[PDB]
C-alpha cells in the first residue's frame, strides 16, 4: 500500500544518496528487444533498467536529496536507468545509446549529482 | 442475423442494443449477430 | 517476421527465405561456408523482412529446448511430463547453461540453469 510506497521511496532514496550518480532518460516506442540489448550491454553492472510509477518516482526524488522536487517525473513513459554504485560505465553506455538513436529524451539526473548538459557529459566521460 | 430464444455470447463480439426499443444482437461478423434471441 | 530452424548442411532448402528478396545462391553459399566447420545438423537461423534485402541473415548456436536429449543420450522427446526418460549429470547441464548464458536474458550461470530446468520440465527429465 502507501506505507510500502513510502518504504520503497526511502530505500531508493538511500540508494540514490549512496550512489551519487543517477541519470534518467526516456525513449520513444521503448521496445523489449532494444531494452534487452541495452541491458545486456550493461552486463554485471549495478545500474538497473525499468519504468517505475510516476508518483513513487517523484516522491523518491523529493526524498532523495536530489536536484528538484517534482520537475519531469510526469507526461511520458518514464524509462529509468537507476545508476547504482559505479556509474562511469553506466554513464558511457547510456550516453552511447543516446547517440545511437535519433534522440533520447533527457529527463533528469546527473553523473554524481551536479547537473551539466549531456554534450559536456560525453566529453568529460571521454 | 439469427432468431433464437436464449442469447449467449458465442463469439468475442456478441453485444446487444435496445435500438428503437427493439433488441438487436450484433457482432463484428455478419453471421454471429442475432435478433429477438 | 518468422522464425526458422533447419539443417546446417545446406541453406538452399527454404522457398520462403528465397522469396524475401535475397538471391538463393547468395545465402546458400554464404551460410554453407560460414558453417563449413560444422554442418549437416539442425541450426536455428534468423532473418528480417527488409526492402532491399541484399543480405540480412544470421544464424545461432544449436537450440537448447529439447537438446537435453543429446545430453540424456536418448531420443523421442516426450509429450507429457509423467515419467522420467533418463538422467543427465548436473555438471554437463551447468556447462551447457554457461555455454548458452551469453545468448539469453540470463545474466548468471544459475539463471541459464533455471531456464534449462524450465524447458526440461515438459520432457519429464529435470536437472539431476
Amino acid at each position: 500500500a502507501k506505507k510500502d510506497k513510502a518504504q520503497q521511496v526511502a530505500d531508493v532514496s538511500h540508494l540514490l544518496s549512496t550512489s551519487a550518480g543517477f541519470v534518467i532518460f526516456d525513449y520513444t516506442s521503448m521496445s523489449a528487444i532494444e531494452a534487452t540489448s541495452i541491458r545486456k550491454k550493461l552486463f554485471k553492472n549495478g545500474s538497473k533498467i525499468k519504468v517505475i510509477k510516476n508518483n513513487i518516482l517523484r516522491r523518491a526524488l523529493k526524498a532523495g536529496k536530489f536536484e528538484g522536487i517534482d520537475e519531469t517525473a510526469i507526461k511520458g513513459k518514464l524509462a529509468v536507468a537507476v545508476g547504482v554504485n559505479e556509474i562511469v560505465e553506466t554513464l558511457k553506455a547510456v550516453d552511447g545509446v543516446v547517440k545511437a538513436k535519433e534522440a533520447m529524451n533527457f529527463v533528469c539526473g546527473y553523473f554524481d549529482n551536479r547537473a551539466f548538459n549531456s554534450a559536456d557529459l560525453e566529453k568529460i566521460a571521454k | 442475423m439469427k432468431v433464437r430464444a436464449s442469447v449467449k455470447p458465442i463469439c468475442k463480439d456478441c453485444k446487444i442494443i435496445k435500438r428503437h426499443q427493439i433488441v438487436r444482437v450484433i457482432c463484428k461478423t455478419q453471421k454471429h449477430k442475432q435478433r429477438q434471441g | 517476421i518468422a522464425k526458422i530452424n533447419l539443417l546446417g548442411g545446406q541453406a538452399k532448402p527454404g522457398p520462403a527465405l528465397a522469396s524475401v528478396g535475397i538471391n538463393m545462391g547468395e545465402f546458400t553459399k554464404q551460410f554453407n561456408e560460414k558453417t563449413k566447420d560444422k554442418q549437416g545438423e539442425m541450426i536455428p537461423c534468423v532473418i528480417t523482412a527488409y526492402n532491399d534485402k541484399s543480405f540480412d541473415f544470421i544464424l545461432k548456436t544449436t537450440p537448447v529446448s529439447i537438446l537435453l536429449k543429446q545430453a540424456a543420450k536418448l531420443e523421442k522427446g516426450a509429450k507429457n511430463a509423467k515419467t522420467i526418460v533418463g538422467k543427465i549429470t548436473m555438471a554437463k547441464a551447468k556447462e551447457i547453461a554457461q555455454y548458452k548464458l551469453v545468448d539469453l536474458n540470463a545474466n548468471t550461470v544459475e539463471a541459464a540453469l533455471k531456464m534449462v530446468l524450465g524447458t526440461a520440465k515438459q520432457m519429464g527429465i529435470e536437472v539431476i
Binding site: - | - | 538471391n23 547468395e26 553459399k29 554464404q30 561456408e33 532491399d52 541484399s54 543480405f55 540480412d56
Partner: protein
C-alpha cells in the same frame, strides 16, 4: 562490411565492363551503362566479404584500377 569500387579502366573495354556491371544482379542495359559512364560507381553494398572478394576477383581478372575498403 567491405565494398569494392571501380577506378580508371584498363583495355578501355566499355562493353566488357558494362557486362561486368550487369552480371552483379541482372540489372538492365540502361542503368548499367549510365553507371559505367561515370567512372566512380559502386557495384553493390550490404554483402558479405566472400562474394565481394569474388567480385573484386572478376574486376582484377578483366583489368582495371580497383578501389576497396
Amino acid at each position: 562490411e567491405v565494398t569494392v569500387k571501380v577506378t580508371g579502366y584498363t583495355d578501355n573495354a566499355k562493353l566488357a565492363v558494362l557486362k561486368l556491371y550487369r552480371e552483379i544482379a541482372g540489372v538492365g542495359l540502361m542503368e548499367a551503362k549510365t553507371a559505367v559512364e561515370k567512372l566512380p560507381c559502386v557495384v553493390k553494398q550490404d554483402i558479405k566479404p566472400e562474394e565481394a572478394e569474388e567480385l573484386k576477383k572478376r574486376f582484377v581478372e578483366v583489368g582495371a584500377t580497383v578501389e576497396i575498403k
